[PDB]
Design a protein around this ligand. Structure first.
Ligand SMILES: *[C@@H]1O[C@H](CO)[C@@H](O[C@@H]2O[C@H](CO)[C@@H](O[C@@H]3O[C@H](CO[C@H]4O[C@H](CO)[C@@H](O)[C@H](O)[C@@H]4O)[C@@H](O)[C@H](O[C@H]4O[C@H](CO)[C@@H](O)[C@H](O)[C@@H]4O)[C@@H]3O)[C@H](O)[C@H]2NC(C)=O)[C@H](O)[C@H]1NC(C)=O
Ligand SMILES: *[C@@H]1O[C@H](CO)[C@@H](O[C@@H]2O[C@H](CO)[C@@H](O[C@@H]3O[C@H](CO)[C@@H](O)[C@H](O)[C@@H]3O)[C@H](O)[C@H]2NC(C)=O)[C@H](O)[C@H]1NC(C)=O
Ligand SMILES: *[C@@H]1O[C@H](CO)[C@@H](O[C@@H]2O[C@H](CO)[C@@H](O[C@@H]3O[C@H](CO)[C@@H](O)[C@H](O)[C@@H]3O)[C@H](O)[C@H]2NC(C)=O)[C@H](O)[C@H]1NC(C)=O
Ligand SMILES: *[C@@H]1O[C@H](CO)[C@@H](O[C@@H]2O[C@H](CO)[C@@H](O[C@@H]3O[C@H](CO)[C@@H](O)[C@H](O)[C@@H]3O)[C@H](O)[C@H]2NC(C)=O)[C@H](O)[C@H]1NC(C)=O
Ligand SMILES: *[C@@H]1O[C@H](CO)[C@@H](O[C@@H]2O[C@H](CO)[C@@H](O)[C@H](O)[C@H]2NC(C)=O)[C@H](O)[C@H]1NC(C)=O
Ligand SMILES: *[C@@H]1O[C@H](CO)[C@@H](O)[C@H](O)[C@H]1NC(C)=O
Ligand SMILES: *[C@@H]1O[C@H](CO)[C@@H](O)[C@H](O)[C@H]1NC(C)=O
Lengths: 480, 101, 136, 121, 136
């Protein structure tokens, strides 16, 4: 080696695909760090999320959306946030006294859906009729006096028939397994946008060639310090308040032939949905213990019989048509036939979401009742139901009670993606066409947004041959 | 479609002799083999093509490229006779019966 | 394999280009490796863990540079000759074809020898210089 | 550990319904996919359906989706099955089944001991 | 008092030998000084405390070396003469008999003078070199 010597280099552009804990960057700014919680005021950092994107000349990198651990990071952070935020609040254990319940009564209100006054709850069947009026003995603050309070509960929140089939006595559903906790009113928190910023020594790469199938090389790579605004919304059978693909509709699965694997459909044009609970709910406040207050719905005043969601007919129809066309491309020479929800628990057999702190459940049979590459050849109304007692995510053991919100509540959303599954055994000539809506873990929701990103650690030290021997001689070498 | 098709359905094999079974596959996907002990619950043997299941001796082996797999069981003992099934994501082949002479 | 550096790129924007057209972000790469980003809750533990791990990474890298006599510089010529076992590499593509992201793969499986070689050579030079100063 | 218990056999009349139970142990029942396979004698084993105990999501083989209903109970670690309307052609053994990692639907585990049922007239 | 250095001993294996031989293991002790080792619970505080104290000790040592003009080297010759008050130490026993573990007990009660003398001389030399450069 008379012409050949090593050289140390530092600050060199090299990286490897490790894993690490990412920083949480807020909207800049909506956080009052302790006064109230809007998403993560106690925990997350308010700072400038400016991505400052940089394009790279000739980089080619392999992305995988299914193995993206950032969705697991989101899962853990969300669960920790909810668990630590709900911990200080009131416990519902004293409220598990025996409840005597009866059908509700209406003091001469009026019905939207017909031009006549309310006559009977059985015919005026919405809100009123599905909601029971319950009275129960409760302890006062001094522990030696008790009083007959009353509150109105939704039928899913109470359970007869373990109190024998002739008693008209009801419990709260949670007491069979666990004890709930009320949501603190000052803590009430909503889908604030969140940004993930890499820690020092790590770089977050992003792929701009949006149309890649989800597992393969990407050439239009770019580097970003903080990811774009991801909204931590959770919903089933339909993604809402999401992004939109620049190309037409996009479909994603690690193997479409693998029928059990979920199929995420990502739209390019949003379809507007409006959901409303008319009628003015009156927030009753009843005392428990020395310094705890429990909130419940008293009488509902104003016009009552509606709990609806509305979707534009032709817009949703054409959206489903384009989904059908793309799935016909992927599944050649056969129709596409959407169908009712398969079944299962109501949290996934129905479209689920929260507006203004009130959890909604909506029958979606009106929506997927389609045929060949579209619907068969004006607004579609979804009947809905409401629960107050909530199991936090799918089937986790942490229960929660949602206090009612007074007055009429209305919300709007942009539908951006769908969650589908496929029929199984065959019967080949008459099976490939069928598709249904399906539930989804929150990983499935957050994957549609953390699709783009990957995390790599910098390896800033490298070695290479150069022309120098330390203080001694030069070099003879080669060229391209 | 007709994703699986095993052959030969019927096989006569003496003890200590090598067995041979074939399973076609008309679509891309995983493949495997199951051992139905007669009058008992079947059990996994080979999966993901050639990789053996847990606790299976080295008599059981096979391989494929694309639309044709060959299974071979060298020197089959008396206890391992029965019926063998081919599976791919949901389907089952019609099965192949091996009896001891 | 070398060229006149710059800092206005902000971050890792090259990348991609060959080593002779990529070993120029050394100032900014060194800068961003450590600087930034910056009722009871525990994510202070997470933040402190990230900060401490980054600091320890930087300190280990700087120590490894210091042992080889390279601390205080980004570029650093050294005395260790090219290995007796290699004498083969594709230098025509080192100078103007391979980017760093590619070249880093070819030096793998052999890097562990180079650190020991550098350390031994530096310590030999250290004692030699001490003896030279002690000569008179 | 994996263990798939099942109920005993029984005899049914045409047009009547049956129920079957299968109980889990030794693992997390909520997170792990569960399956069911019919196994009739002397012909193709047939697929029947899937079950995801976390959300209770299900999916059915097309020729049976007009009859099958598949449920579970998390607090008892028990899966359940039913045929809403039987026929003599349903005579077969029923095998509740997992996958060993069960990040992959296919099975790839027990195959518990099974349960035979016959429809006769 | 000096020897051709080594790193193959892994850790503190010498020790014991005289200063003229124990002064070869500088690299490995320098390396191992900082590197390694790496539902609600608090021992994250313990781990962070240990890591932070280790890093702080290393930074203090490196700063003290830097003030004396020695940062970037393990061996470091300086200019401060042997103290006017000492002129007596047992150097025949320094070179080949006393190990470092023994010699460290004898330089005690006097090290604080050296940690001032070194920085005094270094600052004098610094301003002298600055003046020499300014001379042109
Ligand atoms: C998907 O994206 C849509 C937007 O595209 C979101 O829509 C918003 O939804 C939130 C609830 O989730 C709505 O928030 C509520 O708005 C009420 C009306 O606000 C107007 O009127 C008040 C005066 O009455 C003005 O001050 C205000 O500036 C608006 O002009 C508020 O009255 C409500 O107040 C309650 O909440 C706040 C915050 O917790 C409390 O501080 C208050 O004391 C009070 O309790 C509430 O803020 C919002 O209006 C909706 N925006 C639009 C444009 O419709 C969806 O929420 C989002 N997610 C989903 C699942 O759809
Ligand atoms: C969602 O879509 C439904 C159906 O298109 C809407 O229902 C309509 O609601 C209005 C009141 O908000 C009803 O108006 C009343 O109509 C009667 C005649 O039927 C009239 O006598 C009354 O004076 C009053 O105008 C309307 O009838 C009703 N339509 C139907 C078909 O029942 C609903 O308003 C939409 N929005 C929401 C938030 O639900
Ligand atoms: C969403 O709403 C639709 C319409 O309200 C519900 O459809 C109804 O579902 C019930 C229960 O599955 C069906 O009951 C069955 O009816 C048949 C006769 O058709 C009877 O033989 C059965 O014994 C059983 O009683 C009902 O027919 C069906 N009606 C319609 C019009 O679809 C649907 O169940 C709702 N889904 C969810 C998830 O809320
Ligand atoms: C796939 O299905 C679509 C329809 O779902 C077929 O294309 C044509 O689409 C237009 C726009 O959606 C249809 O007109 C619309 O019909 C709806 C009723 O579904 C109506 O509400 C709107 O006001 C508008 O009239 C049009 O009828 C439909 N053409 C036919 C023959 O149905 C498309 O042809 C299908 N794909 C293939 C390969 O045939
Ligand atoms: C729900 O039930 C409570 C208790 O029965 C009702 O409250 C009482 O209503 C009667 C008239 O129906 C009044 O005379 C009482 O003064 C009310 N209070 C109490 C403490 O008894 C309440 O009106 C019912 N609400 C509905 C919507 O039916
Ligand atoms: C409502 O109005 C009708 C007709 O005026 C009357 O008969 C009835 O008593 C009123 N109150 C209730 C609770 O129905
Ligand atoms: C479903 O679509 C068919 C199309 O032929 C229609 O006849 C039927 O009324 C629809 N049912 C519902 C509940 O939308």
């Amino acid at each position: 080696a008379e012409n050949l010597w090593v050289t140390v280099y530092y600050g060199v552009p090299v990286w490897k695909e490790a894993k690490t804990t990412l920083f949480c960057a807020s909207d800049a700014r909506a956080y009052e760090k302790e006064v109230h919680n809007v998403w993560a005021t106690h925990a997350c950092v308010p700072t400038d999320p400016s991505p400052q994107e940089l394009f790279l000349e000739n980089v080619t990198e392999n992305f995988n959306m299914w193995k993206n651990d950032m969705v697991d990071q989101m899962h853990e952070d969300i669960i920790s946030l909810w668990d630590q935020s709900l911990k200080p609040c009131v416990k519902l254990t004293p409220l598990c006294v025996t409840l005597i319940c009866s059908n509700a009564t209406v003091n001469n209100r009026t019905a939207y859906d017909t031009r006549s006054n309310v006559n009977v709850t059985s015919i005026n069947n919405t809100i009123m009729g599905e909601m029971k009026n319950c009275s129960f003995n409760t302890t006062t603050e001094i522990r030696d006096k008790e009083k007959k309070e009353y509150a109105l509960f939704y039928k899913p929140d109470i359970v007869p028939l373990n109190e024998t089939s002739n008693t008209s006595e009801y419990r709260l559903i949670n007491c069979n397994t666990s004890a709930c906790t009320q949501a603190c009113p000052k803590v009430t928190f909503e889908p604030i946008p969140i940004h993930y910023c890499a820690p020092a020594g790590y770089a977050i790469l992003k792929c701009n060639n949006e149309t890649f199938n989800g597992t393969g090389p990407c050439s239009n790579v770019s580097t970003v310090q903080c990811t774009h605004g991801i909204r931590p919304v959770v919903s089933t059978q339909l993604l809402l308040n999401g992004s939109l693909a620049e190309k037409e509709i996009v479909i994603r699965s690690e193997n479409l032939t693998n029928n059990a694997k979920i199929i995420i459909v990502h739209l390019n044009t949003s379809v507007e949905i409006v959901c409303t609970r008319p009628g003015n709910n009156t927030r009753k406040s009843v005392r428990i213990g020395p310094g705890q207050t429990f909130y419940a719905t008293g009488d509902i005043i104003g016009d009552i019989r509606q709990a609806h969601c509305n979707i534009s007919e032709k817009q949703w129809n054409e959206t489903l048509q384009k989904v059908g066309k793309e799935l016909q491309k992927h599944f050649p020479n056969k129709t596409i036939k959407y169908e009712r929800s398969a079944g299962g628990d109501m949290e996934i057999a129905t479209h689920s979401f929260n507006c203004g702190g009130e959890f909604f459940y909506c029958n979606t049979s009106k929506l997927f009742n389609g045929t060949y590459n579209g619907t068969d050849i004006s607004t579609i109304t979804l009947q809905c139901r409401i629960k107050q007692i909530i199991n936090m995510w799918q089937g986790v053991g942490r229960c929660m009670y949602a206090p009612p919100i007074a007055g009429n509540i209305t919300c709007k959303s942009n539908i951006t993606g769908l969650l589908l599954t496929r029929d199984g055994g065959t019967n080949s000539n008459k099976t490939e066409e069928t598709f249904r809506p399906a539930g989804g873990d929150m990983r499935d929701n957050w994957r549609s947004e953390l699709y783009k990103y990957k995390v790599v650690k910098i390896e800033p030290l490298g070695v290479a041959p150069t022309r120098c021997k330390r203080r001694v001689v030069g070099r003879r070498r080669r060229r391209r | 479609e007709i994703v699986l098709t095993q052959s030969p359905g019927t096989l006569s094999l003496s003890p200590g002799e090598t067995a041979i079974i074939s399973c076609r596959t008309s679509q891309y996907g995983s493949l495997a083999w199951y051992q139905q002990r007669p009058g008992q619950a079947p059990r996994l043997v080979i999966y993901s093509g050639s990789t053996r299941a847990a606790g299976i001796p080295d008599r059981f082996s096979g391989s494929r490229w694309g639309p044709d797999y060959n299974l071979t069981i060298s020197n089959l003992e008396s206890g391992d006779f029965g019926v063998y099934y081919c599976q791919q994501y949901e389907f089952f082949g019609q099965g192949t019966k091996v009896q001891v002479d | 394999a070398v060229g006149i550096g710059a800092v206005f790129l902000g971050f890792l924007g090259a990348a991609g280009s060959t080593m002779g057209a990529a070993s120029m972000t050394l100032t900014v790469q060194a800068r961003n490796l450590l600087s930034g980003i910056v009722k009871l809750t525990v994510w202070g533990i997470k933040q402190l863990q990230a900060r401490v791990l980054a600091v320890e990474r930087y300190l280990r890298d700087q120590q490894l540079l210091g042992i080889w006599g390279c601390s205080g510089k980004l570029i650093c010529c050294t005395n260790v000759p090219w290995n007796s076992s290699w004498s083969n590499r594709n230098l025509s593509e080192i100078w103007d074809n391979m980017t760093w992201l590619q070249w880093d793969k070819e030096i793998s499986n052999y890097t562990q020898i180079i650190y020991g070689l550098l350390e031994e050579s530096q310590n030999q030079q250290e004692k030699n210089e001490q003896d030279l100063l002690a000569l008179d | 550990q994996v263990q798939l218990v099942q109920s005993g056999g029984q005899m049914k009349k045409p047009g009547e319904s049956m129920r079957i139970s299968c109980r889990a142990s030794g693992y997390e029942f909520i997170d792990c996919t569960l399956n069911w396979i019919r196994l009739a004698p002397g012909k193709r084993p047939e697929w029947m359906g899937w079950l995801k105990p976390r959300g209770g999501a299900v999916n059915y083989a097309r020729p049976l989706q007009g009859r099958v209903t598949m449920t579970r109970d998390v607090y008892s670690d028990t899966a359940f099955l039913e045929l809403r309307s039987l026929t003599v052609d349903d005579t077969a053994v029923y095998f509740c089944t997992r996958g060993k990692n069960c990040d992959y639907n296919w099975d790839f585990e027990h195959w518990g001991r099974g349960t035979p049922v016959i429809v006769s007239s």
